[PDB]
Structures are given as C-alpha cells and as structure tokens.
Symmetry: C3
Subunit: 216 residues, 3 copies
C-alpha cells in the first residue's frame, strides 16, 4: 500500500540473505575469528527483523509536527552501530577505555536521534539532530585520532573509510527527509537508507569476513 | 479479580523466596563462585519484580487482534534468559565469541517474541513466533554443538538438559495460549508459565548453586 | 512556562559545561586513566541530554493517580548510576562477580523506580519505592562490606562517602515530592534533584579526575 514498501521488502530480503550467508560462512574454530563472525552475523540479523517490522507496519508511528516516522530504525541502530564499532575496535586491539567512549557516544547518537525523530515541536527536532551529529563527529574523530599487524592495518583502513563515508550520509538523509525538512519524499528517503543500511552491514561484513585480519 | 491472579501471586512468592534463599546462601569469597551466585540470584530477583508487576496490573496491556497481553514477561526474559545462558557459558569457559552469539540470539528471540505479542495483525503474530523459534533453535544448537573438569562436565550436562526441555515448552505455550491460537485459556497459560518460570529460575539455580562446579 | 523550568535549564547548563570540562581535561594515554575519563565524561553527557529533554518538555508525561512525572530521569539514571558504580568498582579492582551484583541491583533500583513513578494505583507506588530502596540498600552494603594502593584507598573512601550521602537523598526526595506524597511542590523537587544530580555527576567526577588514583 505505502509506496516505500518495495524498498522495505528488498531491505528485508537483502538483510535476510546476508545473515544466512555469514552464518554458513562462519561454520571456524579460531577464537578471534569467532568473535568477528558473531558480531558481523548478528548485525544484519537484527536489521532483518527491524526491516521486517517496518514492512509489516509495526515499526511505524505517526508523529504530529501527522508525519509517518519509522521508529524501528533506531531500535536497529541502537544495537547494530555499536556492534560495527566493536568490529573496528577489536581489529586494532583498542583499550577498553576507548571502547566505552565509542559505545557510549554511539548510544547518545542513536538516543538523541530517536528523541529528535519523535519530537512534536518542529524546531526542536533539529536541536536533537545537532547533538546527535556532534556525537557522530566525536566517533569519527576517535576512529582517526583515538587509535599493528599489516593485514590488520590494511583491513582497518578500508573498513574505517567505508564507515566514515556511509555514516556521514545518515544525518544528511535525515535532515532532508521526512524526519527533518521534508524536501525528499519518504519513498526516496526509505530507498537511501536501504542502500546505506545494506552497504554498511552486508558490504562491511563481506570486506571484513573475507580478510585474513580476523584470525589471530 | 482476574482469574490468573493466583498463579501471578504464587509466582511472585516463589521468585521472592528463591531470591532470599540464594542471597543468604551466597553470604563466599571464591571469585568464580561469586560470579555464579550473582547471576543466579539476580535472575529470580528480576522475575520477582516482573511477576509483581503483572499481579498488580502494571505489566498487562490490551492488544486488539481486545486481548490481555502480559508484556512484563518479555522485560523479565530480556534480562533473565541471557543471564541463564551466561551461567552455562561460564561453566564451560566459552570463548567470548560464543557468548556474544548466544546473548545476541537470545535478544533476537525475546525481541521478536515481544513484537509478535503486540502485533495487531493476527496472521503476522505467527511470523514473529517463527523467527523467535528459529533464534531459540540456534541457541539450543550452540549449547549442544557450539561447545573440561569432570564436575563441570556433569553439572553442565544436567543444566543444559534442563534448559533444552523447559525452554522448548515456552514457544508451545505461547502458540496455544492467548498470544497465539487462543486454544488454552489465559488462566491455564499463566499457570504453565509460572511452573516453567520457577523451574527454569529457582530449580536451575538450586542445581547449580549446590554443585561444586562453581568453585575454581 | 512551567515554574521548574529554571532548574531544568541550569541543570542542562551545568551538565553541559561539566561534560566539556571533562572532555578537554581528558585530552591521556594511560589505559586505566582512559577508562575513568570515559566513564566519568559519559555520565554528565547523558545527563545533559536527559535534562534537555525535560526542559523542552519531551521527558515529561502525565500520570493519573493528572500528575506531571518526569520519566526522563529514569532513562538518565538507568545508564549513569551503573557507570558511577563502575568508577568505584574499577578503583578497587572489584571481582567481576561483585560488578554484576552492583550493576544488576542498580538496574532493579531504577526499573522499579520507574514502575513506581508510572503506577496509577497510588498505594502501589510506595510498594515499588520500597523494593527500589531495598536494592539501593543492598548497593550501599556492597560498597562498604563487599570490597589496595593508599591513594586508591583514600580516593575510594571519599567517593564512596559522597555516594552514600547523595544517593540516600534520592529516595527521600521521591517520597515527599510529586512522585510520592506530594508534600514538596514539583518546583522544589526539581531543584533538589538538580543539586543532587550535579553533585553526584560533576562533583564526583571532579574529585575522581583530579586524583592520581586513576593512573596505573
Ligand atoms: C546499519 C546502520 C548504520 C551504520 C547507521 C548509522 C546511522 C547514523 C550514523 C545516524 C546518525 C544520525 C545523526 C548523526 C543525526 C540524527 C539522525 C541520525 C540518527 C540518522
Ligand atoms: C525464566 C524464563 C525463561 C527461561 C524463558 C524462556 C523463554 C523462551 C525460550 C521463549 C521463547 C519464545 C519463542 C521461542 C517464540 C515466541 C514466544 C516466546 C518468546 C515465548
Ligand atoms: C546522577 C544520578 C544519581 C546518582 C541518581 C541516583 C538515584 C537513586 C539512588 C534513586 C533511588 C530511588 C529509590 C532508592 C526509590 C525509588 C525512587 C528512586 C528511583 C529515586
């Protein structure tokens, strides 16, 4: 019924297939590699469920500021974005202190994202967007300045670059889409997030899980 | 007022008493044993609070598909089921990678359980049930195939068998009860969950905390 | 508009400034010290966001028992109180078992706090208050009886004393304020929590982050 259904359906499909691929691929005894397979398989598994929830209409609510807001995205990102950061952190043997900073900053990013998404005073939505963007920028700063076997170095560099590029798109899509200024229709916005989500999840995992960096 | 009150009241009582028993019993210097006492005491403490919430009417909502759904169960299981899995994982010195898989799969199980519980399209409730059951089955697979001092071996075998049997009952009760097909009345369903919950929590803890497997 | 706005605004300001101070101060290579800076900076960062949410009206709901309840407090405390306990636990090199007990007990404290805050049967609100207070008392007991370099000893003693005093005020404020008996107006209650929150967060962090106890 809703025009964006096609992109929700494809996202569900692609997340589903990616999960099954990583699950089959991970069938691995090396403790380190097992950690990467676990993190990297859980990511699209979670996204699969949240995409499904949006397709079926459960992960959608109306916010008066009567705007269709897919809140399920934030339930997804609350878990999947810290997991993706753990993949990076583990590659480089990050100190626990740096892990907590990343995870905590990420929680703030998604939580303020959600508050902004659900806020009924239009102008205040963008205050929450700004705070969330600050947390994102802190995360990007830590990834470049806050942190090594050569193969770990090469793979970390690729994944970090992928991360900086894709993650930076999210706040732009939100600002111009139905959560923000409403300059890009919900249908197109759903498509953008779908492309970003699959790349950031399945794309990312493929690069990581095909590299020898994950073995001790 | 509501017929199931008696089973909510007994569950609250039994969870309460089990918590106090484990608390008194744990009054223990061995680091390993302290970890088991903590996990195993927190479990029925959480369940106590969620049983209380249901007795008092706070953990109950009406879902139109006007069906009384005790959502408090899922707030309980979200924390207590991973904790029970940590008890198992620690016994056998599981690799962190295997722990994340178990915990993550468990989160998916309960989260999709909850979505199914609260879904307003009747047919879709059972799609969520199926996904949750898949996650449960993955958990059971890991417990048997994804993993040792003899006393650890004996105790792990008992607890794992208890786990496989009791946990497998939960999806059956849900399917036939008020969350699913509505073939078994809410009153009887509440009783089944109460028996399962106490066994899976207090029964489980008694077997674990009386074994010498918990000491290094 | 609402009289308590001034205290929400100052709390937001003070939490904001404290976060920036700790962030600048932490600009530190020692792994141990990094852990303390992370925990201690995240704390007022979270509180900043939740104070903002209350100022802007998002973190407030009406509970019929038509009472204005700031639920945002509990979203704050759910994360910040375990973090503050981790600061203490790490100082003294607590066993993981003791950490889980503290964190778990803290989760119960805040969760039952929230249930009480949102409960529509007046008398039952204080049952939840009593359970939460029991969990708090268990936490205080562990801090004194459940647990060392001299500088670690001195700093831990100060922070623990600060903790026992400030934390014990929270249940009293709740009982006499708008969540409980309604003997102290919401405006004054908001002020009390603001003073307690800043002391418990910024005060606490200043004492910790100025001590040499945080370096290995
Ligand atoms: C698989 C999903 C991924 C990698 C999602 C990343 C999402 C973000 C980095 C979102 C950031 C946002 C802001 C920085 C501002 C407010 C809007 C958000 C939550 C989209
Ligand atoms: C103390 C509580 C325990 C051990 C609960 C275990 C609960 C489950 C294994 C529930 C499983 C479910 C499914 C597998 C399908 C959907 C319905 C659920 C959530 C009951
Ligand atoms: C920064 C915030 C801090 C340190 C908050 C501490 C809050 C508590 C210790 C609250 C305790 C409560 C009870 C013990 C009973 C019910 C009411 C609560 C949640 C305020």
């Amino acid at each position: 019924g809703r025009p964006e259904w096609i992109w929700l359906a494809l996202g569900t499909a692609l997340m589903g297939l990616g999960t099954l691929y990583f699950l089959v691929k991970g069938m691995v005894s090396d403790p380190d590699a097992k950690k990467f397979y676990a993190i990297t398989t859980l990511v699209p598994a979670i996204a699969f469920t949240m995409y499904l929830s949006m397709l079926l209409g459960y992960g959608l609510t109306m916010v008066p500021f009567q705007n269709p807001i897919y809140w399920a995205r934030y339930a997804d990102w609350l878990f999947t974005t810290p997991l993706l950061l753990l993949d990076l952190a583990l590659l480089v043997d990050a100190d626990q202190g740096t892990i907590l900073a990343l995870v905590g900053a990420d929680g703030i990013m998604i939580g303020t994202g959600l508050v902004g998404a659900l806020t009924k005073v239009y102008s205040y939505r963008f205050v929450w967007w700004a705070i969330s963007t600050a947390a994102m920028l802190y995360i990007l700063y830590v990834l470049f300045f806050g942190f090594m076997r050569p193969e770990v170095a090469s793979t970390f560099k690729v994944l970090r670059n992928v991360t900086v590029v894709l993650w930076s798109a999210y706040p732009v899509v939100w600002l111009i889409g139905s959560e923000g200024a409403g300059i890009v229709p919900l249908n197109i916005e759903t498509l953008l997030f779908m492309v970003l989500d699959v790349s950031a999840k399945v794309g990312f995992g493929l690069i990581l899980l095909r590299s020898r960096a994950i073995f001790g």
